[PDB]
Scaffold this active site. Structure first.
Site, PDB file in Angstrom:
ATOM      1  N   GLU A  84       0.939  -1.267  -0.028  1.00  0.00           N
ATOM      2  CA  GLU A  84      -0.111  -0.124  -0.081  1.00  0.00           C
ATOM      3  C   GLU A  84       0.906   1.274   0.002  1.00  0.00           C
ATOM      4  OE1 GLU A  84      -2.496  -2.299  -0.652  1.00  0.00           O
ATOM      5  OE2 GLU A  84      -1.855  -2.954   1.348  1.00  0.00           O
ATOM      6  N   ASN A  86       0.033  -7.117  -3.924  1.00  0.00           N
ATOM      7  CA  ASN A  86      -0.783  -6.322  -4.855  1.00  0.00           C
ATOM      8  C   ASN A  86       0.339  -5.430  -5.338  1.00  0.00           C
ATOM      9  OD1 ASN A  86      -0.074  -4.675  -2.207  1.00  0.00           O
ATOM     10  ND2 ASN A  86      -1.105  -3.052  -3.320  1.00  0.00           N
ATOM     11  N   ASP A 125      -6.938  -5.215  -5.096  1.00  0.00           N
ATOM     12  CA  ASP A 125      -6.119  -5.436  -4.088  1.00  0.00           C
ATOM     13  C   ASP A 125      -6.189  -6.993  -3.795  1.00  0.00           C
ATOM     14  OD1 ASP A 125      -3.620  -4.105  -1.986  1.00  0.00           O
ATOM     15  OD2 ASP A 125      -5.135  -5.368  -0.907  1.00  0.00           O
TER      16      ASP A 125
HETATM   17 LA   LIG Z   1      -1.956  -5.127  -0.193  1.00  0.00          LA
END
Ligand SMILES: [La+3]
Length: 579
Positions: free
Chosen positions: A171, A255, A297
């Site tokens: 993130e 991700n 994600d």
């Molecule tokens: La993540």
């Protein structure tokens, strides 16, 4: 390590967070069986002095239990001969800046034991090896820089003379890697990135295959626009497995950083890929991307449980995976041939299926549904109704396998999601998300947010499923007593039948369980223990004190009723039979 293989062969111990190298989470002890776990009672308790999210599970090697905590990642060594008295304590000093640079709670996923040393991967990307009898620091090395947004929540993997560790920060625009350090030395041996040029991927362009065919030169950068791969994501905060007969380390990449997909054009390889690397060199024999160009994600970090099963009448080295995207993957762990890819939640709607017709031209690619695709609906547009949520059908909670029933006991989630992405500029040390989310239970079911199911991976079918009010964030543990243990987020430690699935035991631990069930034998008596203390990403509203329904990346408002059942915690509960 051979120490590690020595410990797995003795069922009275737990040297790995994954029980064994194969991540089967299978215990050979059968004292607590399916007809006496009704008579389970609490042996003793122990509190950690730490709140927020208690993931993972404690180690025991011999008569000493080793307990880890979340931030600041304190390790307690409990002498089971002395009545769980603290033999030694290691509280490391780390900066509190690191916590706002953790996306997904202060959690830490546990320790590993190897060659008289306890190895702890701290939250500030610091790999420490502590003396197993002393607690003195043998060595300490920083794996990354939280300055740039790089943290760690996962455990280590000790292989032979090396320790391979992971990094988190999907993130935060971190381009990530899986790095191996020497066991005794702590010196860096090799680092294999999930993203970037071929030399730091440690890939052979002509010999490393994906879906049977070689991946070719510049496999990663052909799918990335410019130098966005440096901010490319694909981090490694899950569990790692290892096969000694094949000399292959298995993990999954996370991700592709930003949650806005049209700002992130291309397949974004190799995010969301099953990886299979050599432990000494680090270069991968095979790889496979489950979710090309991720829009939701759906981190492919989940454990790969290594099995030796009969597929189509032929005994084959297998690898089974329960991704967050909602598909239960079954793969050949030697070649990488994807055998089975079926949904282990029937409400998953983002893809019709995974195309496994070998000459289908979409081979190995999930057929993304246009209505549940965040990029096809575009930026600043709300994608309503996507199942599963960004936490996925199953997050960090590891699944268990029983070689006697041949099934996979996976704790799953039953939540969906509204998705709205937007463009965001990258800044080092700051979040790189670009999405406002809101989560809720699955719309067409019992209203619960979780399910504990058994999985036939040789055909892709759910044999039985037990609904749960909240999600099942606790790791599962199957044993030879035909019982499977798992913990819920209302504090309950449940034991059900291995084949039938009927609830046989249920006890209220002081807080919600996001840790994994372990078992051990001390003085001939089998004990099973679990860590309590709700948190992670399902309890991020209680862990961080978040009150807004959209905060916590959508999960704070979804688990609103969770604060009617539990508060913050930090206790370890140990169980046994009366005998
Ligand atoms: La993540």
């Amino acid at each position: 390590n051979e120490s590690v293989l020595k410990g797995v062969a003795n069922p009275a111990e737990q040297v790995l967070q994954t029980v064994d190298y194969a991540n089967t989470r299978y215990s050979k002890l059968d004292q607590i069986n399916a007809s006496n776990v009704k008579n389970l009672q609490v042996a003793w308790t122990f509190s950690t002095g730490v709140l927020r999210g208690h993931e993972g599970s404690p180690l025991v090697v011999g008569n000493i239990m080793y307990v880890h905590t979340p931030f600041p990642n304190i390790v307690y060594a409990l002498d089971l001969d002395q009545g769980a008295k603290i033999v030694w304590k290691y509280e490391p000093k780390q900066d509190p800046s690191v916590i706002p640079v953790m996306c997904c709670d202060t959690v830490n996923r546990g320790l590993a034991y190897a060659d008289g040393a306890i190895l702890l991967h701290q939250a500030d990307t610091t790999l420490v090896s502590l003396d197993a009898k002393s607690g003195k620091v043998n060595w300490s090395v920083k794996n990354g820089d939280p300055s740039k947004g790089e943290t760690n929540t996962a455990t280590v993997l000790p292989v032979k003379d090396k320790v391979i560790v992971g990094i988190s920060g999907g993130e935060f625009g971190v381009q990530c890697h899986v790095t191996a350090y020497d066991l005794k030395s702590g010196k860096k041996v090799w680092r294999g990135y999930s993203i970037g040029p071929d030399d730091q991927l440690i890939v052979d362009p002509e010999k490393t295959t994906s879906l049977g065919k070689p991946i070719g030169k510049d496999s990663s950068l052909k799918t990335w626009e410019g130098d966005q791969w440096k901010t490319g994501g694909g981090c490694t905060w899950g569990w790692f497995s290892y096969d000694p007969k094949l000399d292959l380390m298995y993990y999954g990449s996370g991700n592709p950083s930003t949650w806005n997909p049209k700002q992130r054009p291309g397949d974004n390889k190799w995010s969301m890929t099953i990886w299979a690397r050599n432990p000494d060199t680090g270069m991968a024999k095979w790889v496979y991307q489950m979710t090309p160009h991720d829009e939701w994600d759906f981190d492919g970090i989940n454990e790969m449980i290594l099995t030796d099963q009969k597929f189509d009448g032929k005994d084959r080295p297998l690898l089974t995976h329960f991704d967050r995207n909602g598909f239960g993957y079954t793969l050949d762990r030697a070649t990488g041939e994807v055998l089975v890819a079926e949904k282990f939640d029937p409400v998953v709607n983002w893809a019709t299926k995974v195309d496994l017709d070998k000459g289908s031209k979409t081979y190995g690619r999930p057929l993304v549904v246009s209505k549940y695709s965040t990029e096809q609906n575009g930026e600043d547009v709300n994608s309503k109704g996507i199942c599963p949520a960004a936490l996925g059908t199953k997050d960090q909670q590891p699944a268990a396998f029983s070689p006697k029933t041949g099934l996979f006991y996976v704790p799953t989630n039953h939540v969906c999601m509204d998705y709205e992405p937007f463009r965001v500029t990258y800044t080092p040390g700051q979040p790189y998300v670009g999405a406002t989310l809101s989560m809720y239970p699955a719309p067409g079911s019992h209203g619960g947010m979780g399910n504990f199911i058994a999985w036939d991976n040789l055909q892709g079918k759910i044999k039985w499923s037990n609904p749960e009010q909240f999600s099942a964030w606790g790791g599962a543990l199957a044993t030879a007593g035909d019982v499977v243990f798992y913990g819920t987020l209302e504090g309950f430690l449940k034991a059900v039948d291995s084949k039938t699935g009927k609830e046989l035991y249920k006890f209220k631990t002081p807080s919600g369980i996001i840790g994994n069930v372990m078992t051990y034998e001390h003085k001939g008596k089998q004990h099973v223990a679990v860590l309590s203390g709700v948190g992670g990403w399902a309890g991020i509203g209680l862990a961080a004190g978040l009150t807004d329904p959209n905060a916590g990346l959508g999960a704070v408002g979804g688990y609103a009723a969770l604060s009617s059942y539990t508060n913050l915690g930090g206790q370890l509960t140990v169980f046994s039979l009366p005998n």
